Design a protein around this nucleic acid. Sequence first.
RNA 1: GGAGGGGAGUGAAAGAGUACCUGAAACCGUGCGCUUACAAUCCGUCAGAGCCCUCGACGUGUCGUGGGGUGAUGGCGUGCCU
RNA 2: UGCAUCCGGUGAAGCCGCCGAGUGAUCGAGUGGUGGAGGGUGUGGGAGUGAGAAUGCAGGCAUGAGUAGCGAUUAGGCAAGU
Lengths: 146, 124, 54, 49, 114, 100
Amino acid sequence: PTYTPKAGDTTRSWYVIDASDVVLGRLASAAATLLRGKHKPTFTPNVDGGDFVIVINADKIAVSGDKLTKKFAYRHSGYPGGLRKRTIGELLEKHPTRVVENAIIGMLPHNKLGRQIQKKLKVYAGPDHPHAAQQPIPFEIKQVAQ
Amino acid sequence: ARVKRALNAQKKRRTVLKASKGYRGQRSRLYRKAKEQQLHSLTYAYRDRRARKGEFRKLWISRINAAARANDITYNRLIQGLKAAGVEVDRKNLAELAVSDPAAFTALVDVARAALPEDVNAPS
Amino acid sequence: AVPKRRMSRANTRSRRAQWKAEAPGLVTVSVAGQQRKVPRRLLKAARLGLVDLD
Amino acid sequence: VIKLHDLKPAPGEKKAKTRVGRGEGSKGKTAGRGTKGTKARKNVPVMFE
Amino acid sequence: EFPSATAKARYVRVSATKARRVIDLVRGKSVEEALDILRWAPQAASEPVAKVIASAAANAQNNEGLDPSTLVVATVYADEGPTAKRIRPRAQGRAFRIRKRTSHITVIVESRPP
Amino acid sequence: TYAIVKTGGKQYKVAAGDVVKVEKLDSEPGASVSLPVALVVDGANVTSKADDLAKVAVTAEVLEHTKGPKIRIHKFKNKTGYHKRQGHRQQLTVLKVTGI
RNA sequence: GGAGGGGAGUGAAAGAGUACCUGAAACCGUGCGCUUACAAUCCGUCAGAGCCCUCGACGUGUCGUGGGGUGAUGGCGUGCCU
RNA sequence: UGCAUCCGGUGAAGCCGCCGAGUGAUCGAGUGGUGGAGGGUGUGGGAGUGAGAAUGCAGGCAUGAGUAGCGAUUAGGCAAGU
């Protein structure tokens, strides 16, 4: 029958993506792919068999057009008139990692397994990360050809 | 003659309630509410036995795509090359190879890449 | 007002469990030689003899 | 030899009574009357148009 | 497994909920501790429950020959016994039912060692 | 080694000694059917060409004819009265592969 | 205190104790196993991790033509009747 | 129920289960437990013959809920007793 992982088959690898001059959605799609495990042949949609994904230089993410000023990240407090919006530039200068996070989190499944997958995502605005002990492999975002 | 119907009646009740083990609340305990769910449950099972083929196909395809893109080829051109090479292997066994015999998967990938044309974006 | 629907067993029991009793904490007392157990609230009165120890 | 337990009606002699209102796998829930109308609770005369 | 003795107070004039409220304080406890708890418990059902526990203890002592020191309330449960029905009259001619519930309090004490 | 055997309109990955349930074959227990293949893997080398495979078969001993699980169909449509009960036990054969 | 019970006895049987033949279900408990306190659930279905039990095999615990109970998790999914 | 057969205090029915079976209603002269006296099969005959719904009827039991309320406009308390 068709393969299912059993309790020790989920191997974790650490990848690291330099988000310098990389397109936001491009990076986020790639990272969600790795975090979910679509790049793996052991992929089982009921399993977080994905890989850890570090993102560095999140502040240097590339955003096309006027999205830096006319795309808003909205948020609601639950209270009336509690809609607070903040552009992507405002968000980049305040909380740089939040744009990359939000992008990936939206590209991920909105479920309990998605929540479990978020934990493998580490995002850092500089070029440096503390997860060097884990020996992360650099991951260039390629495009398979045809 | 007058017929006490409990004896014939309780049978379907026993049947349904024995089928409705594991259900929450009324659905496991009461005939009238277990019956409602056994309708839904067997409808869902009929639907899902047919959608299961699609779901497993979806899974096998995901795994094949993964292994293929690890061997530097897309799923679509892999399938194209296999059909051009006359490999009638099904996606189930391709996925099983991708998991258990990546070398054989690479061999089939090479086969498909050979059988593909030189310009896949040409009419031919 | 009235309840719209029959509360499920789970919820009913979930709060019916909260209708419990906090057991009283007891302490030892040596009235008439024997070691009996009483509440600390009643310790003094038990030493005196104002506590019906059945 | 022909005993009483050897006696059987001829084929087609006995057709089972149709029992209406005994489940939706049979003539159930309306007894072939349809939904509403005079014809759902009464029968209409033949002398009436 | 352990040696045991049982008691049942059947047709007790208290409800099984109000018995369980006190039984849950003594389940698993030694007989001495249980009787002290039920003595100093403000709940009225503590009295019957204690009578039953004492009965099972004395049964273990006399009928079965066990030391009352080693006794534990290994099992205890109340069961919703019969239920007499009455009519409380109310406003505007209506008549509400009242349920005088009873309980069967069963106890099984075991002489678990120390 | 192993192979991918075509039978029952489906495909089964098998090796020698592997026991597989397949659709009903017009055979009897103790018989030794010979089945075609779609792929053969003698470790590293991978036979995939149609002629090279048609030169290969897979021998399998029929152990028993059996019946699959009881499928219980109860088709239902709301507010019509339409119920339809039905059942199924699919006939199957158990094959122990012996050679490739 | 009684009620009620436990021993003892009667009885073929007290799982026949004047609440009494059998003694279902709703309903109420107790105990054991599994599960559940970051989660949005027509309450199930399909896949299914892990845990427990069981039947066989070999070899000594991993495997199976397996069976069951639980169910993390994923997909799908708008009660019955009129 | 007619007829013919069969089972049964060496334990029928009913009930609870296990293991299973059938395309379906459903089955179990397969099994255990409980139980205590009538049942099964075949062939015909006859039906008070199948309920989930009728704001259905009766009984029993839940939900609310250990919730409201515990029935005026006077007020109870101490000691001693039983």
